[PDB]
Amino acid sequence: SFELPALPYAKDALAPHISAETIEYHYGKHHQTYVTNLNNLIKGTAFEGKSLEEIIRSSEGGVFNNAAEVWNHTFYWNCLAPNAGGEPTGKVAEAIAASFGSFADFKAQFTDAAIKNFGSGWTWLVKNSDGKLAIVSTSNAGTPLTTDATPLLTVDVWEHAYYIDYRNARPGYLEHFWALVNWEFVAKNLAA
Amino acid sequence: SFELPALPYAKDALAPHISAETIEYHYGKHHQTYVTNLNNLIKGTAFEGKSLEEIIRSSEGGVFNNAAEVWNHTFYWNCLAPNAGGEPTGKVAEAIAASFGSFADFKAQFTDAAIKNFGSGWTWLVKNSDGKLAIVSTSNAGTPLTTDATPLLTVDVWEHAYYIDYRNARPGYLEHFWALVNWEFVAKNLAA
Ligand SMILES: [Fe+2]
Ligand SMILES: [Fe+2]
Ligand SMILES: [O]
Ligand SMILES: [O]
């Protein structure tokens, strides 16, 4: 069965940008529950033995929602880090400048997309199959994995991701997200 | 321009079932923001002169999302009250018993639907135009007003409705919702 991968840092490592309490609920309750529900829903089914990505690309309904959310959250935790944030360098910086005009342009576009992604969902930096970077949003458990675009960076805009720390101020959460971005992970994703 | 209608009670009236803090944010920030955003989108447009309902039934995208949420929240506050809850009497009791067998069955079914509603949204008791009652769930700003059916009761299951008080425990929030239901309002809705 699928297991909840260990958080890449201590539960308080993202403070004050994302609190230890947010981590305890978001990781320990929400993410854990998606793992448990996924395992239960796939027992005895043709989805047993399949990778998480394989399930995401071949499922609908509850199986999809849980599988995609498991993957999305693991991806999200890796997108964040202590002692990180700031501006990317190298190939990531160059690709962002080429695709959006500048890092500042990208940051504003990503922020705007995330803030205006209505309801629950995720906002993504992806590499489209044309080789160009783009910002796309998804609803609920939706993920670029069901397309031919490669996810590079994401922000969870489900209210549970930020409500403890920012209440209604999703834009405040976005401001603090930038202080946490793990560009090393983004660079790995782009290089792949 | 649209005004945020006054809350039917002070912000502590629903406590401890829904906290004063929740109401301060939910009414004073979320509901207010929907009003502000709606006004900004419709100013100087052909949506001026239209009632809230007329906008909801003739719009899409941002105009729709904001107009529907303004209406949904006003309806929600009217569905809740101090010194209420328990079970309906008279016409409402009769109608629910006729359509669901018993109030207890209705209560279980409504609760189940509300807990299963994935992501942000609303769960409703409606009266169809042939008089049948039904439980329906909607996503995000979705509302029975865009259908033929008449809303009788709703619960908001956006995480902002409960996260301060219940965190991830949406079922706890639902339990406490029942302690607040304003059956007088439900009766008005049914009698219209
Ligand atoms: Fe999440
Ligand atoms: Fe709400
Ligand atoms: O999420
Ligand atoms: O909401």
From Swiss-Prot, chains A, B:
One family name in Pfam for this protein: Sod_Fe_C
The enzyme's E.C. designation: 1.15.1.1
Entry note: cofactor: Binds 1 Fe cation per subunit.
Cofactor: Fe cation
Catalytic activity annotation: 2 superoxide + 2 H(+) = H2O2 + O2
GO BP: any one term: response to superoxide
Signal peptide range in chain numbering: none
InterPro entries, A to Z: Mn/Fe_SOD (IPR001189), Mn/Fe_SOD_BS (IPR019833), Mn/Fe_SOD_C (IPR019832), Mn/Fe_SOD_N (IPR019831), Mn/Fe_SOD_N_sf (IPR036324), SOD_C_sf (IPR036314)
Expression induction or repression: The transcript is subject to small RNA (sRNA)-mediated degradation; sRNA RyhB-binding at the ribosome-binding site (RBS) both blocks translation and induces mRNA cleavage by the RNA degradosome over 350 bases downstream. RhyB blocks translation even in the absence of the RNA degradosome. Deletion of fur derepresses rhyB expression, and leads to less expression of this gene.
Superkingdom field: Bacteria
Group of enzyme by EC: oxidoreductase
Gene Ontology cellular component list: cytoplasm; cytosol; membrane
Modified residues (N6-acetyllysine): 50
Keywords: Acetylation, Iron, Metal-binding, Oxidoreductase
Annotated positions binding Fe cation: 26, 73, 156, 160
Molecular function via GO: iron ion binding; oxidoreductase activity; superoxide dismutase activity
Quaternary data: Homodimer.
NCBIfam families named in the record: PRK10543.1
Function (record text): Destroys superoxide anion radicals which are normally produced within the cells and which are toxic to biological systems.
Membership in a protein family: Belongs to the iron/manganese superoxide dismutase family.
Name this polypeptide is given: Superoxide dismutase [Fe]
Organism annotation: Escherichia coli (strain K12)
Gene symbol of the encoding locus: sodB
